[PDB]
Design an enzyme around this catalytic site. Structure first.
Site, PDB file in Angstrom:
ATOM      1  N   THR A  93      -1.912  -0.192  -4.764  1.00  0.00           N
ATOM      2  CA  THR A  93      -0.719  -0.013  -3.942  1.00  0.00           C
ATOM      3  C   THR A  93       0.489  -0.681  -4.619  1.00  0.00           C
ATOM      4  O   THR A  93       1.603  -0.140  -4.605  1.00  0.00           O
ATOM      5  CB  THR A  93      -0.920  -0.625  -2.543  1.00  0.00           C
ATOM      6  OG1 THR A  93      -1.968   0.081  -1.873  1.00  0.00           O
ATOM      7  CG2 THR A  93       0.340  -0.528  -1.718  1.00  0.00           C
ATOM      8  N   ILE A 144      -7.372  -9.960  -5.586  1.00  0.00           N
ATOM      9  CA  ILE A 144      -6.692  -8.887  -6.303  1.00  0.00           C
ATOM     10  C   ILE A 144      -5.256  -9.189  -5.863  1.00  0.00           C
ATOM     11  O   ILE A 144      -4.845  -8.881  -4.744  1.00  0.00           O
ATOM     12  CB  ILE A 144      -7.203  -7.499  -5.846  1.00  0.00           C
ATOM     13  CG1 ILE A 144      -8.691  -7.385  -6.192  1.00  0.00           C
ATOM     14  CG2 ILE A 144      -6.447  -6.380  -6.561  1.00  0.00           C
ATOM     15  CD1 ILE A 144      -9.324  -6.057  -5.832  1.00  0.00           C
ATOM     16  N   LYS A 196     -12.063  -5.621  -0.863  1.00  0.00           N
ATOM     17  CA  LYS A 196     -10.761  -6.231  -1.127  1.00  0.00           C
ATOM     18  C   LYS A 196     -10.246  -6.326   0.317  1.00  0.00           C
ATOM     19  O   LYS A 196      -9.772  -5.338   0.882  1.00  0.00           O
ATOM     20  CB  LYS A 196      -9.842  -5.327  -1.947  1.00  0.00           C
ATOM     21  CG  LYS A 196      -8.486  -5.973  -2.256  1.00  0.00           C
ATOM     22  CD  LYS A 196      -7.481  -4.957  -2.787  1.00  0.00           C
ATOM     23  CE  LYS A 196      -6.127  -5.601  -3.026  1.00  0.00           C
ATOM     24  NZ  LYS A 196      -5.191  -4.625  -3.514  1.00  0.00           N
ATOM     25  N   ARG A 236      -1.791  -0.734   6.543  1.00  0.00           N
ATOM     26  CA  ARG A 236      -1.176   0.395   5.864  1.00  0.00           C
ATOM     27  C   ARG A 236      -1.906   1.698   6.188  1.00  0.00           C
ATOM     28  O   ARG A 236      -1.271   2.735   6.396  1.00  0.00           O
ATOM     29  CB  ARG A 236      -1.165   0.174   4.344  1.00  0.00           C
ATOM     30  CG  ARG A 236      -0.718  -1.213   3.932  1.00  0.00           C
ATOM     31  CD  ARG A 236      -0.419  -1.311   2.444  1.00  0.00           C
ATOM     32  NE  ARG A 236       0.804  -0.585   2.132  1.00  0.00           N
ATOM     33  CZ  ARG A 236       1.760  -1.025   1.320  1.00  0.00           C
ATOM     34  NH1 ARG A 236       1.655  -2.200   0.718  1.00  0.00           N
ATOM     35  NH2 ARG A 236       2.836  -0.283   1.119  1.00  0.00           N
ATOM     36  N   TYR A 239      -3.618   7.347   7.113  1.00  0.00           N
ATOM     37  CA  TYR A 239      -2.940   8.388   7.892  1.00  0.00           C
ATOM     38  C   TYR A 239      -3.811   9.316   8.756  1.00  0.00           C
ATOM     39  O   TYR A 239      -3.557   9.446   9.949  1.00  0.00           O
ATOM     40  CB  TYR A 239      -2.063   9.242   6.973  1.00  0.00           C
ATOM     41  CG  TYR A 239      -1.115  10.149   7.720  1.00  0.00           C
ATOM     42  CD1 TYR A 239       0.035   9.638   8.323  1.00  0.00           C
ATOM     43  CD2 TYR A 239      -1.397  11.509   7.877  1.00  0.00           C
ATOM     44  CE1 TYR A 239       0.884  10.454   9.073  1.00  0.00           C
ATOM     45  CE2 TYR A 239      -0.552  12.339   8.629  1.00  0.00           C
ATOM     46  CZ  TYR A 239       0.587  11.801   9.224  1.00  0.00           C
ATOM     47  OH  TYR A 239       1.416  12.606   9.977  1.00  0.00           O
ATOM     48  N   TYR A 241     -11.418  -1.249  -0.190  1.00  0.00           N
ATOM     49  CA  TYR A 241     -10.115  -1.845   0.106  1.00  0.00           C
ATOM     50  C   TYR A 241      -9.748  -1.654   1.585  1.00  0.00           C
ATOM     51  O   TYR A 241      -9.180  -0.634   1.971  1.00  0.00           O
ATOM     52  CB  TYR A 241      -9.063  -1.216  -0.814  1.00  0.00           C
ATOM     53  CG  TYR A 241      -7.655  -1.778  -0.719  1.00  0.00           C
ATOM     54  CD1 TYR A 241      -7.385  -2.966  -0.038  1.00  0.00           C
ATOM     55  CD2 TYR A 241      -6.591  -1.118  -1.338  1.00  0.00           C
ATOM     56  CE1 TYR A 241      -6.079  -3.483   0.022  1.00  0.00           C
ATOM     57  CE2 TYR A 241      -5.291  -1.620  -1.288  1.00  0.00           C
ATOM     58  CZ  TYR A 241      -5.036  -2.798  -0.612  1.00  0.00           C
ATOM     59  OH  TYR A 241      -3.748  -3.293  -0.583  1.00  0.00           O
TER      60      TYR A 241
END
Lengths: 292, 292, 292, 292
Positions: free
Chosen positions: D43, D203, D161, D137, D106, D132
């Site tokens: 990202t 990360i 992550k 998000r 989304y 992740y």
């Protein structure tokens, strides 16, 4: 400053009354087990369902039993500034070592409102104030800058009981407020990471059921021995989550009742934890070594 | 059945006491202006900062002033079931037409605990009960099934004051709870859509400053004349919006103070609304033709 | 101006490819059933799992089939402004009547970035642009001022597809953006309240399975006959509710498959809706008289 | 397992193209500075605005420059399962040491959907997969049990992550998944507390600008030296928050540009960080010793 495993005492009830004997025994055992401090009448002690006189009895019983052996930080908050002050005046006159004031809940004051709330309480206070920031229950937040402004302008405000679940907080507060800012966690499961961030202790729920282990865990973090702390987390995690299966202090009271230390009586709108959850709590204690 | 514009009365203060003359003239003006009903000591009436004696005086003055002209639904909620029963008993004994019971705030009870909360209150009641579902302040929710179950098992529970902001609710409740379920909105700015989904009215904050326009709005909605209701929205939206620029009732009290109907006095933790917001409220009232 | 029941078309799959025959018959049936407009490749059309070539074929087949009978608003959003411009250019070149541009998802751009996003797209467009504001999936919001500013500075931006669930929005937008602002809802279950607040229509998911009933619902709303619209809500709510039991379009595809209008094929990460939910959808269609 | 400071590489752009030289230099400096690993096209590397070929160029440039000196974990996620697989196939064929697959964003798949997503990607993979989990998000969550099921059934899935901001997670995952579960943090500001909970590394975003200090911090946590780690947190906090003033990687690119290591070019919908924030970032670097 306050530090280590500070127990947020569950309030034992019996026959719709405060169970004086169970509470005295809880406090004594809590002290001989290693607790660094006690918080009578906090959320875990069901402050919302306690009457003005019961709250006072619990604070006083706790203060007299502790007999100065450990700090006693009386829960004295409210979403009414005038009432928080009445509670704080009683706490200090009763010999309390400090008070725990939650951010006003339900009525959602603005930051300036929250600021004035604590400034007025600080004025009527003569003991240490720990700001209890828990957006999840209060439905309002205390911004870092607001917290910093309150710390700076109120001589009695010494720190915070952080229950945001945002670990950037202890670091951001270390920046806004100095290292002299008392950083206490309000959540057991992440106390490990909170201490790594410079935390001083934890006003605990789990310490109600596993006082000695929580004491060792805390002492381990205070000694900077995070490897031991991890192993302790390994032993205490099942209980940390099991104690919050439904709504606290429903699991803590079931646990303490399962140990024969009090009746599991809870006051409405709170109700006894679900049976399948009672088993999970049992195995969680067996895993920690608490339950045979 | 309750319907129309039911004003969630602000509680006028003066010299740190209830301003009884201002309260009386507010109820009176409110009634002669067309309000369908009054809700004394709700969240807009700053119930959280009201002493129990003040709570009672405000309810009684409203009832006495209403003189049976419009229904008076007394705020009687609390996050303590025992305390809620005390407010309800007082209210009905004082002649209240019903009670507004918010979901237990801060202590986050499970759904079963909420159900038992209202079942215990329904057993002590002799008057209609309206459930105030407002997740944003209580930090807890009342699922539709729970709400339907409460309606089913509690003969005095007659409806809801929906403040979820989720417009599926009145539709889902019409399904789960029949059409005999009394649907009221807790938010002014979305009352228009609520009525279109079958709502019966709104326990209003805006009705405090524009009782006449709000009552007309509701009457339009009730007559199914949504064209007129929309036209009224155009006229009231600026005010609906400005009255909530900061935490309510800070905005309504500023407005009623600007209109000369009381002092803007608010009790901590709540503080007077910001000056640039006072201007927006002024402009909104001028736009609504409430101010010249 | 777009209005009425605008179907957010599901994209029929068969053997891991677009089911063109099923897509054609869906558009056709949709049109002869009374739908006001079609939105190919929206979120309900599983645009995220569509190859760029499939995206184009679906838009083109819909346009060709529509044959100018109803407006076709092509989904052309992306969290990459460059990519969005490519979808818009293709769409308008294919004869689309407008484009549905969602707010950039996942990458959480600031308000200025969103404004520049739409300003860059508006500069490449020659057809009407509708802003798809859906915070719950994009993890970002479009403040009213930002939306008003975009409407003001972007000649092709004509309206919004509101999926916030915040009914104050259409009212606040009517103020910030004039009444010439095209207001469409993204959620079926609250369209009724949206229209009462001045909405012009709804880009529908439910219209996929009940095109005829939804079109009538919208026509009632449009004629200001909210009494009839409510009666239709009673008939459609069970379906509006069941179609969203799990993540959309899993429910709509199950329904259209049960109706025999396509295969229920969905592309990963999306999976077929749970069996007990399939039953609820069956009962909802029977209740809506869509199924015998 | 992977551990320590693993840099989530910002992608330098120049003339609307990938800045090959700036990227090579970034990777080299990153390695000589102490980074334990690199994550190209995450990202922070603006994967959403990269074209298929650019993504491939960045992964390959990163792999060739690293030349096996440190692990290279290529970002290869998408909200489309078929595309994640295409990205994963390229990564492994390019010589990547692993891939970083975000939870589908989304389209909000169900837990079973998320499960099948990773099971299919795992099948087409021959290298380590790190899940992740970033609800903030993606607008969806990966439950601990779901994560545990994925770990158990997918031989290639080695860890996570974590970017939930919930520190109970590393402890709960240590319980669900064993100690062989790779625990990496996705947020710099709380890496300190994450490591205390048994975390293996981070990360990082900050490592882009302060690679050596972040390396020391991480190594300090790996050595169990939390006192040094705290002092490092003391030095790095201003940068951690300043780097996230607006939306990442806007601050990281301003910082790296301020250091003369690349142009600060960002791709729409993202835009350059606000000027006042640029100063805060400057003083933050001066505080860390990075900026003279």
């Amino acid at each position: 400053m306050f530090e280590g495993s500070i127990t947020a005492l569950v309030t034992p009830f019996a026959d719709d009354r405060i169970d004086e004997v169970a509470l005295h025994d809880l406090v004594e055992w809590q002290i001989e087990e290693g607790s660094f401090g006690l918080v009578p009448c906090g959320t875990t002690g069901e402050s919302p369902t306690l009457s003005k006189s019961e709250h006072e009895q619990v604070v006083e019983i706790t203060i007299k039993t502790a007999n100065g052996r450990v700090p006693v930080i009386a829960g004295a908050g409210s979403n009414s500034t005038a009432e928080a002050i009445a509670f704080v005046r009683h706490a200090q006159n009763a010999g309390a070592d400090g008070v725990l004031i939650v951010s006003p809940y339900y009525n959602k004051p603005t930051q300036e409102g929250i600021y004035q709330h604590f400034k007025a309480i600080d004025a009527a206070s003569t003991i240490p104030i720990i700001v209890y920031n828990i957006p999840g229950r209060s439905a309002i937040e205390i911004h870092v800058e607001t917290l910093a402004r309150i710390f700076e302008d109120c001589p009695n405000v010494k720190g915070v009981k952080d229950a945001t679940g945002n670990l950037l907080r202890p670091s951001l507060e270390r920046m806004a407020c100095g290292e002299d800012f008392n950083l206490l966690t309000g959540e057991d499961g992440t106390a490990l990471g909170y201490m790594a961030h410079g935390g001083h202790g934890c006003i605990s729920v789990t310490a109600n059921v596993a006082p000695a282990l929580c004491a060792d865990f805390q002492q381990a973090c205070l000694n900077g021995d995070f490897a031991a702390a991890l192993k302790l987390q390994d032993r205490l995690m099942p209980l940390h989550r099991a104690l919050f299966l439904e709504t606290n202090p429903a699991g803590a009271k079931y646990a303490l009742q399962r140990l024969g230390r009090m009746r599991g009586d809870l006051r409405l709108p709170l109700v006894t934890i679900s049976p399948s959850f009672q088993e999970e709590i049992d195995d969680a204690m067996r895993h920690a070594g608490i339950l045979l």
